[PDB]
Amino acid sequence: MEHVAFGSEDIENTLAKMDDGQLDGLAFGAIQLDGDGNILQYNAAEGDITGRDPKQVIGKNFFKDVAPCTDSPEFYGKFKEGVASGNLNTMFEYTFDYQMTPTKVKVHMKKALSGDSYWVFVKRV
Numbered sequence: 181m182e183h184v185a186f187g188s189e190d191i192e193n194t195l196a197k198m199d200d201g202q203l204d205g206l207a208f209g210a211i212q213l214d215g216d217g218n219i220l221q222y223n224a225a226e227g228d229i230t231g232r233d234p235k236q237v238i239g240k241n242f243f244k245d246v247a248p249c250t251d252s253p254e255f256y257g258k259f260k261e262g263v264a265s266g267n268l269n270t271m272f273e274y275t276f277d278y279q280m281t282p283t284k285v286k287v288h289m290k291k292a293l294s295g296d297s298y299w300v301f302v303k304r305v
């Protein structure tokens with residue numbers, strides 16, 4: 181395991197040092213998105229929660245292609261306000277239900293350290 185707690189205040193500093201292999205050792209799901217919502221990184225824990233194959237979803241658009249249930253003011257709307265303003269730090273519960281058993285999760289979205297990149301962190305609740 182790579183020990184990092186979900187919700188930690190300096191999580192973007194800690195994860196800036198990790199390659200794809202180290203991201204797969206986290207205890208929670210982690211997705212890195214660019215400012216248009218395309219998936220740059222997607223770890224093994226996220227694939228275990230959602231059933232998606234991490235290697236196949238890289239390069240797809242999260243809001244248009246992979247996760248249409250997040251195309252809503254409650255999720256995508258918060259993301260796009262964050263990208264526009266250049267700052268984002270929000271945590272909320274949500275249900276993922278597209279082509280899968282509905283699964284309740286806690287989501288934490290936070291701007292990365294790398295300029296136009298954004299994290300989505302996910303844990304079961």
Ligand SMILES: *C(=O)/C=C/c1ccc(O)cc1
Nearest residue numbers: 230247248249250276278
């Ligand atoms: C709703 O369509 C949610 C889908 C989803 C959430 C998170 C993922 O990693 C993959 C699909």
